[PDB]
């Protein structure tokens, strides 16, 4: 769970004599950092 | 104390008697009580036309007193000219102090708020009968439990019972205006029969059994 996810389609490598070159794509763990509130207050009944 | 009646469609004064009283030998001290002549009850009412005052006829209301207040002369005697104004006299008559109707319904439990006021012509207000009880029970009610100058543990902690609306303390109220109300010997029994609330409103209503 080190990484949330990965698309497994877009590792790109190439190789020349001794060198090689790559690429690739990790989607990491996203945040939550805002949360919104609408708090709303009603009458109410209460009865025998 | 007395109970009502009224007359019915050809009934003769014995079967009110022992329907009441048990003998229908008491009929002959009861008609006294209503100031009959002898057509005690008679059934047309151009014959009530003959004298009016002194008869009753079919729909007329009777005046029927409890059994120890059926032999007492006291009692004939003020039953057989009073007639309606029996209620006035048996539940009282006293000055009205309900000037401002809609305006003590908007700072009850507060002082100052009750006045003398004026009907017919050059006489102060009085209130009689049932509309006395509705004022002293309204009174009361609003006014805090030790505050008259003299025979104190009368009237209510109404002004000290507000509290967060939670229904305990709706019950607290509904308890101390059943107190309250019961109080007064006068009144039989009080019970709630709704409490009800608007957020930041109490709102209910009792029932009160007067005695006849």
Redesign the interface.
């Given at each position: 769970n080190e990484i949330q996810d990965f698309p497994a389609e877009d590792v790109q490598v190439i190789v020349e004599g001794n060198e090689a070159r790559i690429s690739m794509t990790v989607y990491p763990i996203r945040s939550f950092k805002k949360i919104s509130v609408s708090l709303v207050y009603k009458?109410?009944?209460?009865?025998? | 104390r007395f109970k009502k009646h009224v007359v019915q469609h050809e009934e003769t004064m014995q079967a009110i008697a022992q329907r009441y009283y048990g003998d229908v030998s008491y009929w002959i001290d009861l008609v006294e009580h209503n100031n009959l002549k002898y057509p005690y009850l008679v059934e047309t009412d151009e014959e009530k036309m003959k004298d009016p005052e002194r008869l009753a006829s079919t729909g007329d209301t009777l005046i029927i007193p409890i059994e120890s207040d059926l032999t007492d002369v006291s009692a004939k005697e003020i039953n057989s000219r009073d007639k309606d104004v029996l209620v006035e006299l048996a539940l009282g008559r006293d000055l009205n102090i309900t000037a401002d109707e809609k305006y003590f319904n908007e700072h009850g439990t507060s002082d100052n708020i009750l006045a003398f006021s004026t009907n017919g012509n050059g006489d102060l207000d009085t209130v009689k009968g049932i509309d006395n009880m509705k004022q002293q029970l309204q009174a009361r009610l609003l006014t805090p439990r030790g505050s008259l100058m003299l025979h104190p543990n009368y009237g209510s902690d109404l002004h000290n019972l507000f509290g967060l609306n939670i229904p305990e303390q709706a019950t607290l109220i509904e308890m101390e205006v059943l107190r309250t109300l019961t109080s007064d010997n006068r009144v039989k029994s009080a019970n709630l029969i709704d409490w009800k609330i608007q957020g930041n409103v109490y709102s209910g209503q009792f029932s009160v059994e007067i005695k006849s």
């Amino acid at each position: 769970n080190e990484i949330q996810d990965f698309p497994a389609e877009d590792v790109q490598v190439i190789v020349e004599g001794n060198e090689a070159r790559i690429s690739m794509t990790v989607y990491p763990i996203r945040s939550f950092k805002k949360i919104s509130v609408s708090l709303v207050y009603k009458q109410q009944t209460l009865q025998a | 104390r007395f109970k009502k009646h009224v007359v019915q469609h050809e009934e003769t004064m014995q079967a009110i008697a022992q329907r009441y009283y048990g003998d229908v030998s008491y009929w002959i001290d009861l008609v006294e009580h209503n100031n009959l002549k002898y057509p005690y009850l008679v059934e047309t009412d151009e014959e009530k036309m003959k004298d009016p005052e002194r008869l009753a006829s079919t729909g007329d209301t009777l005046i029927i007193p409890i059994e120890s207040d059926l032999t007492d002369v006291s009692a004939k005697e003020i039953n057989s000219r009073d007639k309606d104004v029996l209620v006035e006299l048996a539940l009282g008559r006293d000055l009205n102090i309900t000037a401002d109707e809609k305006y003590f319904n908007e700072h009850g439990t507060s002082d100052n708020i009750l006045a003398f006021s004026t009907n017919g012509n050059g006489d102060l207000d009085t209130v009689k009968g049932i509309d006395n009880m509705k004022q002293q029970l309204q009174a009361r009610l609003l006014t805090p439990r030790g505050s008259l100058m003299l025979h104190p543990n009368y009237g209510s902690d109404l002004h000290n019972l507000f509290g967060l609306n939670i229904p305990e303390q709706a019950t607290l109220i509904e308890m101390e205006v059943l107190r309250t109300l019961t109080s007064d010997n006068r009144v039989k029994s009080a019970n709630l029969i709704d409490w009800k609330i608007q957020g930041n409103v109490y709102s209910g209503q009792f029932s009160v059994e007067i005695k006849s």
